[PDB]
């Protein structure tokens, strides 16, 4: 199975320390007016794991819903998940153990947009986002992950649902695997994640802000 | 080349929160009186990367000097090191870039003894030790890593030097590779390291306590 990922890429109610990370409602919405962005791991062109299935400018931020498809990547995650003491401990009641989702939840807890200043380039899964509020929520059902975020209106969800339900090209009768990296890369990426100062308070901050306190796989 | 690792496994001047982690001078020294301990990664029997070359009860703690030998492990570290943004940034002047040492320095910053309550079982490299003062200092020269710790006396160093200079069995004319794990395991281990609450202040604490503020590869 593929894994779906939801979260904000930017937030309108959050003001970044680094002013370059500003991304207001006027700018985001005009950009969405101006064929589907790649999903990579720590902005590595060789670590594309899928695509952004939906994008929606909602009350509080730019929300997106990416799709992790790569068999090569998900197979790395599978083998690595069976060697984590965190994953072994399990998820909160009443969720079923899902080693693959739990590992991604732990390892790639953040979202990071790559944008100008076409205006959006791609989205990266990463340990923590530099913009606050950018918690990554993984799960098998996209309707389910989108429901993790309680402040999304039914108006917002409909706009999102429209995008991830939209059928791709009927032409090619296979699903390509974009992933051109390895577990060595993902291991290389891991050290860096350890040296982001106070990662876990940043993640805790993101969690309560976006109200992901509602059963989730989030490890923070 | 192999890589040497120095650090305390316990400290006499540090009192653990968990009383089970007590390990006093009487007990440590009597245990050293009662064929060389394996060095593994996060206490995984399949992740032996070498051996403890020396052990010395000094003024402040149980100090040890392990040796990371595995070609299979060091080759994983090599490939992963070329994919770290931390490793790319380099070490402090005036040290030469050493991607392998830098990665281990970042990734496995802690030491963890496995002991009773024969009394010592093995030593694990890990992200952070649960006992404080247990900073891992890596480097190519064992005389050099031992010199990172300024509070070790020349009496202490001589006792250590004796042990790592002592010739092994002249019988077998090869050096075996104990490592029976993979990069998937090391990747699996990495998530857990992310969820140790305030890892970096613990590491900073260890660093100044043992006076590793003297050019080092330590990333904390």
């Amino acid at each position: 199975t593929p894994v779906y990922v939801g979260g904000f890429l930017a937030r309108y109610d959050q003001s970044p320390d680094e002013a370059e990370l500003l991304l207001p409602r006027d700018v985001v919405e005009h950009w969405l007016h101006a064929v589907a962005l790649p999903l990579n791991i720590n902005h590595d062109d060789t670590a594309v794991v899928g695509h952004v299935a939906a994008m929606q400018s909602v009350r509080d931020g730019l929300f997106c819903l990416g799709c992790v498809t790569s068999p090569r990547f998900l197979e790395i995650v599978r083998r690595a998940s069976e060697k984590s003491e965190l994953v072994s401990r399990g998820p909160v009641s009443p969720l079923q153990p899902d080693k693959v989702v739990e590992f991604l939840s732990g390892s790639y807890a953040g979202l990071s947009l790559s944008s100008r200043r076409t205006p959006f380039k791609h989205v990266a899964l990463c340990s923590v986002g530099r913009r606050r509020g950018t918690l990554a929520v993984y799960g098998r059902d996209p309707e389910w992950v989108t429901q993790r975020f309680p402040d999304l209106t039914a108006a917002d969800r409909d706009g999102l649902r429209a995008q991830w339900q939209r059928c791709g090209s009927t032409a090619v009768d296979a699903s390509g695997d974009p992933f051109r990296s390895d577990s060595y890369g993902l291991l290389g990426n891991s050290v860096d994640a350890l040296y982001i100062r106070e990662r876990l308070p940043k993640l805790r901050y993101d969690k309560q802000l976006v109200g992901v306190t509602e059963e989730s796989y989030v490890k923070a | 080349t192999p890589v040497y690792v120095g650090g305390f496994l316990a400290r006499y001047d540090q009192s653990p929160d968990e009383a089970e982690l007590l390990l006093p001078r009487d007990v440590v020294e009597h245990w050293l009186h009662a064929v060389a301990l394996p060095l593994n990664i996060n206490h995984d029997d399949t992740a032996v990367v070498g051996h403890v070359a020396a052990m010395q009860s000094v003024r402040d703690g149980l100090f040890c000097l392990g040796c990371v030998t595995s070609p299979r492990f060091l080759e994983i570290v090599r490939r992963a090191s070329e994919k770290s943004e931390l490793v790319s940034r380099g070490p402090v002047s005036p040290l030469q870039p050493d991607k392998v040492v830098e990665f281990l320095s970042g990734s496995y910053a802690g030491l963890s003894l496995s002991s009773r309550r024969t009394p010592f079982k093995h030593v694990a490299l890990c992200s952070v030790g649960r006992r404080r003062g247990t900073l891992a200092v890596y480097g190519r020269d064992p005389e050099w890593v031992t010199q990172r710790f300024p509070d070790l006396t020349a009496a202490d160093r001589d006792g250590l030097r004796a042990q790592w200079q002592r010739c092994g069995s002249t019988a077998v004319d090869a050096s075996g590779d104990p490592f029976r794990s993979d990069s998937y395991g090391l990747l699996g281990n990495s998530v857990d390291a992310l969820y140790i609450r305030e890892r970096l202040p613990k590491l900073r604490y260890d660093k100044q306590l043992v006076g590793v503020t003297e050019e080092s590869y330590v990333k904390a």
């Binding site: 902005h43 990071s112 790559s114 944008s115 100008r116 530099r130 | -």
Partner: peptide, 13 residues
């Protein structure tokens, strides 16, 4: 490009 990342901050365009 500007990213919302800690390590890969800018990106060629």
């Amino acid at each position: 490009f500007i990213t919302g990342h800690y390590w890969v901050r800018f990106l060629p365009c």
